[PDB]
Design an enzyme around this catalytic site. Structure first.
Site, PDB file in Angstrom:
ATOM      1  N   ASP A  26       3.812  -4.137 -15.218  1.00 33.12           N
ATOM      2  CA  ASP A  26       2.650  -4.494 -14.390  1.00 33.12           C
ATOM      3  C   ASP A  26       1.620  -5.290 -15.194  1.00 33.12           C
ATOM      4  O   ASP A  26       0.446  -4.926 -15.254  1.00 33.12           O
ATOM      5  CB  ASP A  26       1.981  -3.229 -13.845  1.00 33.12           C
ATOM      6  N   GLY A 104       4.043   8.862  -7.175  1.00 32.68           N
ATOM      7  CA  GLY A 104       4.497   9.425  -5.917  1.00 32.68           C
ATOM      8  C   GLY A 104       3.429   9.971  -4.981  1.00 32.68           C
ATOM      9  O   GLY A 104       3.730  10.316  -3.844  1.00 32.68           O
ATOM     10  N   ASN A 143      -3.054   3.908  -0.501  1.00 28.28           N
ATOM     11  CA  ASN A 143      -3.072   4.358  -1.887  1.00 28.28           C
ATOM     12  C   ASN A 143      -3.895   3.393  -2.748  1.00 28.28           C
ATOM     13  O   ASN A 143      -3.571   2.204  -2.842  1.00 28.28           O
ATOM     14  CB  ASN A 143      -1.634   4.453  -2.402  1.00 28.28           C
ATOM     15  N   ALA A 144      -4.948   3.914  -3.376  1.00 32.62           N
ATOM     16  CA  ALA A 144      -5.829   3.096  -4.209  1.00 32.62           C
ATOM     17  C   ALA A 144      -5.318   2.806  -5.627  1.00 32.62           C
ATOM     18  O   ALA A 144      -5.805   3.379  -6.609  1.00 32.62           O
ATOM     19  CB  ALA A 144      -7.228   3.735  -4.275  1.00 32.62           C
ATOM     20  N   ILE A 145      -4.332   1.916  -5.723  1.00 30.10           N
ATOM     21  CA  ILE A 145      -3.779   1.505  -7.011  1.00 30.10           C
ATOM     22  C   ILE A 145      -3.380   0.033  -6.926  1.00 30.10           C
ATOM     23  O   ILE A 145      -3.359  -0.554  -5.836  1.00 30.10           O
ATOM     24  CB  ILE A 145      -2.511   2.319  -7.411  1.00 30.10           C
ATOM     25  N   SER A 163      -0.160   0.420  -2.349  1.00 29.26           N
ATOM     26  CA  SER A 163       1.198   0.812  -2.670  1.00 29.26           C
ATOM     27  C   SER A 163       1.649   1.874  -1.674  1.00 29.26           C
ATOM     28  O   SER A 163       1.100   2.973  -1.624  1.00 29.26           O
ATOM     29  CB  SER A 163       1.277   1.366  -4.091  1.00 29.26           C
ATOM     30  N   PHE A 164       2.648   1.522  -0.876  1.00 27.21           N
ATOM     31  CA  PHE A 164       3.197   2.415   0.128  1.00 27.21           C
ATOM     32  C   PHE A 164       2.172   2.865   1.166  1.00 27.21           C
ATOM     33  O   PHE A 164       1.133   2.225   1.335  1.00 27.21           O
ATOM     34  CB  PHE A 164       3.884   3.601  -0.554  1.00 27.21           C
ATOM     35  N   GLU A 200       3.947  -3.168  -2.545  1.00 24.92           N
ATOM     36  CA  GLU A 200       2.835  -2.859  -3.438  1.00 24.92           C
ATOM     37  C   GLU A 200       2.530  -4.021  -4.375  1.00 24.92           C
ATOM     38  O   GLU A 200       3.151  -5.089  -4.286  1.00 24.92           O
ATOM     39  CB  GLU A 200       3.167  -1.613  -4.279  1.00 24.92           C
TER      40      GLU A 200
HETATM   41  O1  LIG Z   1       4.590   2.533  -7.633  1.00 20.55           O
HETATM   42  C1  LIG Z   1       5.502   3.323  -6.869  1.00 20.55           C
HETATM   43  C2  LIG Z   1       5.017   4.784  -6.736  1.00 20.55           C
HETATM   44  O2  LIG Z   1       5.644   5.505  -5.658  1.00 20.55           O
HETATM   45  C3  LIG Z   1       4.793   5.218  -4.533  1.00 20.55           C
HETATM   46  O3  LIG Z   1       5.131   6.164  -3.484  1.00 20.55           O
HETATM   47  C4  LIG Z   1       6.530   6.530  -3.444  1.00 20.55           C
HETATM   48  C5  LIG Z   1       6.823   7.501  -2.293  1.00 20.55           C
HETATM   49  O4  LIG Z   1       6.723   6.909  -0.968  1.00 20.55           O
HETATM   50  C6  LIG Z   1       5.857   7.765  -0.179  1.00 20.55           C
HETATM   51  O5  LIG Z   1       4.585   7.106  -0.110  1.00 20.55           O
HETATM   52  C7  LIG Z   1       5.843   9.098  -0.857  1.00 20.55           C
HETATM   53  O6  LIG Z   1       4.651   9.844  -0.514  1.00 20.55           O
HETATM   54  C8  LIG Z   1       5.901   8.727  -2.306  1.00 20.55           C
HETATM   55  O7  LIG Z   1       6.432   9.756  -3.147  1.00 20.55           O
HETATM   56  C9  LIG Z   1       3.409   5.397  -5.061  1.00 20.55           C
HETATM   57  O8  LIG Z   1       2.476   4.629  -4.283  1.00 20.55           O
HETATM   58  C10 LIG Z   1       3.500   4.924  -6.490  1.00 20.55           C
HETATM   59  O9  LIG Z   1       2.953   5.881  -7.410  1.00 20.55           O
END
Ligand SMILES: OC[C@@H]1O[C@@H](OC[C@@H]2O[C@H](O)[C@H](O)[C@H]2O)[C@H](O)[C@H]1O
Ligand SMILES: [Ca+2]
Length: 314
Positions: A26, A104, A143-145, A163-164, A200
């Protein structure tokens, strides 16, 4: 790009056969004077420096000790790795945004550190902890990243991240604080529209009246089993709608694939794009199939066709 200065260099004429310490994940790049810098994920935010942008050497980190306020947002975090930093230069100050989170989960917060210079040899060198910018809790649909700052044509700074969950978010920042107003509106601008929603690491750049949103599709962090891919879409308005070559909205899984790797470089992703004169480069990491899938820094010249769509050369 005033906030991503490289002036006096043609990326297209350079030999980008990187050498040195290339382990990275990254990454983003900045150049000050004759010195090049790489900031990437790792303990207290890892830094690498280079004289020519080709030969890299590890150069310490931003935070020797993590600020206590992180715990107010991510109490469960135990280690010191900070993720996906983003760098920009504005009003003589370097703004480095980064992510505090746990893999996650979406209990996360994007932080901001500032410095008057990137050169540790300068008396003014000091990374100041300027606190949280925006965060997400388990109850939020985002997600704040993975932050990215871009100044639109009118000089208005914008922060994209995500992200997600619901996907890529976008929010206006104030030029003075470089943080969003307390009542600023959060906008979702891209999503696979699937579950899980594997999109993401946004990065927006403006080129010839268009705003290009680069994002990473699918899965990172699995070594040679990563399925990361770099996709792109565009819009005349920074707030969207971002659409790909096929006219498909990025809110509905749209996105033109720029690179999905090969049997030698697996899952390229989490990219950054910089320009200089008429040249441009694509920066990202990829998992080395010949080296236990270790994430490696990649810098390649990025071209643009007649339609204005970016493409990597062969
Ligand atoms: O950077 C990737 C990492 O995993 C992302 O989520 C993965 C899964 O998808 C769903 O959102 C579940 O809740 C997560 O476990 C995160 O955004 C990031 O940390
Ligand atoms: Ca990034």
């Amino acid at each position: 790009v005033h906030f991503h200065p490289f002036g006096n260099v043609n990326f297209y004429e350079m030999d980008w056969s990187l050498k040195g310490d290339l382990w990275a994940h990254d990454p983003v790049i900045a150049k000050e004077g004759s010195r090049w810098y790489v900031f990437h994920t790792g303990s207290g935010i890892q830094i690498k420096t280079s004289e020519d942008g080709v030969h890299w050497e590890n150069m310490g980190w931003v935070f020797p000790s993590l600020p206590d306020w992180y715990k107010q947002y991510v109490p469960e975090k135990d280690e010191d790795h900070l993720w996906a930093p983003d760098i920009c230069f504005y009003n003589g100050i370097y703004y480095l945004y980064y992510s505090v989170s746990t893999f996650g989960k979406n209990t996360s917060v994007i932080g901001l550190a500032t410095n008057q210079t990137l050169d540790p040899r300068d008396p003014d060198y000091e990374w100041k902890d300027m606190g949280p910018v925006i965060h997400s809790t388990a109850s939020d649909n985002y997600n704040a990243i993975a932050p990215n700052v871009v100044f639109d044509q009118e000089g208005q700074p914008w922060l994209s991240f995500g992200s997600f969950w619901s996907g890529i978010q976008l929010i206006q920042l104030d030029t003075e604080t470089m943080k969003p107003a307390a009542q600023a509106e959060l906008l979702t601008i891209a999503s696979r529209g699937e579950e899980p929603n594997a999109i993401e690491a946004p990065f927006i750049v403006c080129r010839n009246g268009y705003y290009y949103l680069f994002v990473s599709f699918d899965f990172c962090c699995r070594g040679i089993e990563s399925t990361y891919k770099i996709a792109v879409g565009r819009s005349k308005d920074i707030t969207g709608p971002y659409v790909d070559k096929n006219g498909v909205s990025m809110m509905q899984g749209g996105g033109t694939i720029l690179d999905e790797g090969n049997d030698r470089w697996i899952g390229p992703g989490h990219c950054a794009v910089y320009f200089s004169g008429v040249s441009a480069i694509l920066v990202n990491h990829a998992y080395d199939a010949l080296k236990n899938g270790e994430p490696t820094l990649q810098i390649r010249p990025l071209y643009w066709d007649d339609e204005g769509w970016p493409y990597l050369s062969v």
